[PDB]
């Protein structure tokens, strides 16, 4: 399966698709969320009635914050990948002022919203989601891709109750070591904080942080300021709630491992050390990939184009200049 997946990825990686739609083909309905250089909006393809999520980026803001390379990485990778637990890019284009990425709309909202509301997920609920991430990372790492931004905020729940990973802003194709200080404070591996060279093992540490937060209701390392969070991460010490099972505590000690020669996912057997662990004994790995396992939660469906599972944001008029901005910089987009 992985050998055939690589052939498909490399063909698109070498010759990326460009300019597959235009802004005037879509009706802008409402803002679903915001980011550093723009926003995500619910749109409708007027001639079909199909709904989508459109990510809009201001070219001038990207250049100002020196994020050109990361923005090009995000689009090049997303147009080349194909997996059930990854959000699909339908169209991409640009104009004088902005960059546009049109993705499949996920109406169930972010895992973040549901997790904070109910407090914490049960161990079988946490297991179902964790299994989907394990398979997604197995797929991504095999293509020499590093994700670098795992958190409940980036995990969308579809109408089948399955996960769809979004935001490839820090995704990169790398063989060997990389050095960029990027990610979310609570999810940073100690090797990132200590300005060392790092590899794919940072995604396996992030999985440890995610499983802990899902089962406890709070992260393993928290404070009011990022500097205090970093102090707790580098110390090595982790305390587990009394309700955590014996098998869950053992897996987390192996994922939240400071020593790279001992961290699960980074050993001789690779991903198999995680997949064969006692906590995953009941997991049917093939049935998860095939979407045959019953989901613990199915989000309430209120028709097409409904935004009830998302928070409200202040609207703003999208401006397109009569003069081309940053033409050479984004030539390959």
């Amino acid at each position: 399966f992985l050998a055939k997946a690589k052939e498909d990825f490399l063909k698109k990686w070498e010759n990326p698709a460009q300019n597959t739609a235009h802004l005037d083909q879509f009706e802008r309905i409402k803002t679903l969320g915001t980011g550093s250089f723009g926003r995500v909006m619910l749109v409708k393809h007027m001639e079909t009635g199909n709904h989508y999520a459109m990510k809009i980026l201001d070219k001038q803001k990207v250049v100002k914050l020196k994020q050109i390379e990361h923005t090009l990485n995000e689009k090049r990778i997303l147009q080349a990948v194909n997996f059930p637990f990854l959000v699909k890019l339908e169209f991409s284009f640009k104009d004088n002022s902005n960059l546009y990425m049109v993705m499949e709309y996920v109406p169930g909202g972010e895992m973040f919203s549901h997790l904070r509301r109910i407090g914490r997920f049960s161990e079988p609920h946490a297991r179902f989601y964790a299994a989907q991430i394990v398979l997604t990372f197995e797929y991504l790492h095999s293509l020499d891709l590093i994700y670098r931004d795992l958190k409940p905020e980036n995990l969308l729940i579809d109408q089948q109750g399955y996960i769809q990973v979004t935001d490839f802003g820090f995704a990169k194709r790398v063989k060997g070591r990389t050095w960029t200080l990027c990610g979310t404070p609570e999810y940073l591996a100690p090797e990132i904080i200590l300005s060392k060279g790092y590899n794919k093992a940072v995604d396996w540490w992030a999985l440890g942080v995610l499983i802990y937060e899902m089962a406890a209701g709070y992260p393993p390392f928290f404070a009011d300021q990022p500097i205090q969070i970093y102090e707790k991460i580098v110390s090595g010490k982790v305390r587990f709630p009394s309700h955590f099972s014996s098998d869950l505590k053992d897996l987390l000690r192996n994922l939240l491992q400071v020593d790279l020669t001992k961290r699960f996912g980074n050993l001789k057997n690779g991903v198999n050390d995680i997949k064969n662990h006692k906590w995953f004994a009941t997991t049917d790995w093939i049935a998860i990939y095939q979407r045959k396992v019953e989901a613990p939660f199915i989000p309430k469906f209120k028709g097409p184009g409904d935004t009830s599972n998302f928070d409200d944001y202040e609207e703003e008029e999208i401006r397109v200049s009569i003069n081309e901005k940053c033409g050479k910089e984004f030539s390959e987009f």
Binding site: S36, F112, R116, D149, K151, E153, G169, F170, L181, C182, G183, T184, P185, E186, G217, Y218, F222, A223, D224, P226, R239, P241
Partner: peptide, 18 residues
Amino acid sequence: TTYADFIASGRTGRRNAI
């Protein structure tokens, strides 16, 4: 409790990238 300390902290909302 650790839960009470988390809910009283300033980082319970959506977390942005560094």
